[PDB]
Amino acid sequence: SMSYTWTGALITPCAAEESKLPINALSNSLLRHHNMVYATTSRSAGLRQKKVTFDRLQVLDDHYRDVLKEMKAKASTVKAKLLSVEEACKLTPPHSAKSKFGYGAKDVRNLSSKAVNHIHSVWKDLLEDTVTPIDTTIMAKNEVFCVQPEKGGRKPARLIVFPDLGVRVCEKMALYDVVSTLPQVVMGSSYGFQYSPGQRVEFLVNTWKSKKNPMGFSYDTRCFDSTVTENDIRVEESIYQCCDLAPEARQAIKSLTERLYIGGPLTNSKGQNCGYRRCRASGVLTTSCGNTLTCYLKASAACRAAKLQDCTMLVNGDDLVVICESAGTQEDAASLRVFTEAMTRYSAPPGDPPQPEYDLELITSCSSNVSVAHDASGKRVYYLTRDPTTPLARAAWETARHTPVNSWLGNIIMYAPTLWARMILMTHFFSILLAQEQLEKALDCQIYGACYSIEPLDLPQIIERLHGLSAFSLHSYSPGEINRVASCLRKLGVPPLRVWRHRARSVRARLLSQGGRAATCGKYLFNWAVKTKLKLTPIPAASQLDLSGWFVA
Ligand SMILES: O=C(NCc1ccc(OC(F)(F)F)c(F)c1)[C@H]1CN(c2nc3nc(C4CC4)ncc3s2)CCN1S(=O)(=O)c1ccc(C(F)(F)F)cc1
């Protein structure tokens, strides 16, 4: 079936959409080439519609069936609980889109009677009706990028699809505990979301080291969400139903699958019918868990089809990276084409065709590659980095305009051991927070679908917990990583690393003068900036840390 059909009514904005970086004093000190930075608007939604609209052909085989049987057997060991309305209300993110039935997220979290009893009515309707498609809103997403003269051109807006707030709370009732617990049982060490960056780089490196003769590849599915078929979503459902579930959870999971997850009508911000979806919606509770299960099932079956030896999968939503034993040069190239043919029959055709790699640092996965530095002892330490272009473009944008979501903060947390997050992002934003006197103010950040409220003053213990103490002493980064950063700063008109070192010495001194947590920030986050280093010891609060958040679905 077609992933989408369209009526021709437009995907419309609801807020005023800005596309260009504005004139700013603080922003210009980050990057000068402001004209290289753009934000996607609804005006490019038509171009995205074309990319994501296509017929899916899907043919399944015994390898696919065998893998599924094994997954269902694991899933049969999981017991999940049905949350009450009130419990699911408390798990709703603070800034979630308001209901069209006259209450918003703040009312849901407060357990407002109008909100609670509406959700009860939505639940009752899911129990009685397993068929009628549930309405969804389609919106163009506004995201910031930098122009790439080498790439094809400017990226079109992504499209998001989400049901009403009351339906979103019912999803948590039925499925929050399942999406929380089932994937790690079914997929074990292949399940990507159980890992911090320290733990994911450790798993990738040790998986690579464990092979007699390693080969790996990333596999990039073209428009993964659109390749997910109604059958895939029902197969997903059949996995979930293997859990030990309350009878009302079983019924609501069936209804949510048939009425929402497999597809339904799309409504724009003006309330016009835009069309119909028969693939994955980006804004439902099961999208990360379902995409990870589906990608793992297809990949695992395809590994058996291609006869890859000892193939270790690492799956994070639609992100797939596979590390296996090489069968030799020619045999690996052939086997990866057969892997790709099997993924294609399963309706997961590649964007870029995959290629075997024999150096772990050459694989890109979760937009990131493994790189090497040295800790305070001189020991080799592996960590994940990425091209800093997009983080820096978005950082420039968030400096100039007020944004509800702070990509700079999520990038500091996920890329803390990197040369660029330490030298530029930490120095630049701590300088801003000091001058605004906002060091204590909690900020929202979103990381791969989970939302957190983070005070910048707690970054040292958060980084230690996610990365280890070495994240504050890394030095002697690789020439290729230094060159990539240096080159990106010249391209964007960002001051060179030597300028940041000087700005960081000043930020660091001013933090130390404040004592308390600010001084701990100056001591740990900026020990790299000073000639004579302080002795950095494990932070006490790094053990006792609430690293939990909310799903934004
Ligand atoms: O995405 C994550 N881990 C995977 C990952 C991805 C890219 C990586 O590489 C890169 F980018 F680092 F290079 C990398 F290494 C590691 C994030 C988010 N999480 C999530 N748990 C989920 N669980 C689900 C379940 C429903 C299916 N869905 C979605 C999410 S998102 C929990 C685990 N992490 S995390 O341990 O890194 C983290 C915990 C707490 C904070 C805090 F400090 F903010 F609190 C900040 C980060």
UniProtKB/TrEMBL annotation:
RdRp catalytic domain mapped to chain residues: 214-332
GO biological process, one term: viral RNA genome replication
Domain of life of the organism encoding this protein: Viruses
Keywords of this entry: ATP-binding, Helicase, Hydrolase, Membrane, Nucleotide-binding, Nucleotidyltransferase, Protease, RNA-directed RNA polymerase, Serine protease, Transferase, Transmembrane, Transmembrane helix, Transport, Viral RNA replication
Keyword Nucleotidyltransferase: yes
A Pfam short name: RdRP_3
EC number: 2.7.7.48
Reactions catalysed, as given in the entry: ATP + H2O = ADP + phosphate + H(+); RNA(n) + a ribonucleoside 5'-triphosphate = RNA(n+1) + diphosphate
GO MF assignments: ATP binding; ATP hydrolysis activity; RNA binding; RNA helicase activity; RNA-directed RNA polymerase activity; serine-type peptidase activity
UniProt name for this protein: RNA-directed RNA polymerase
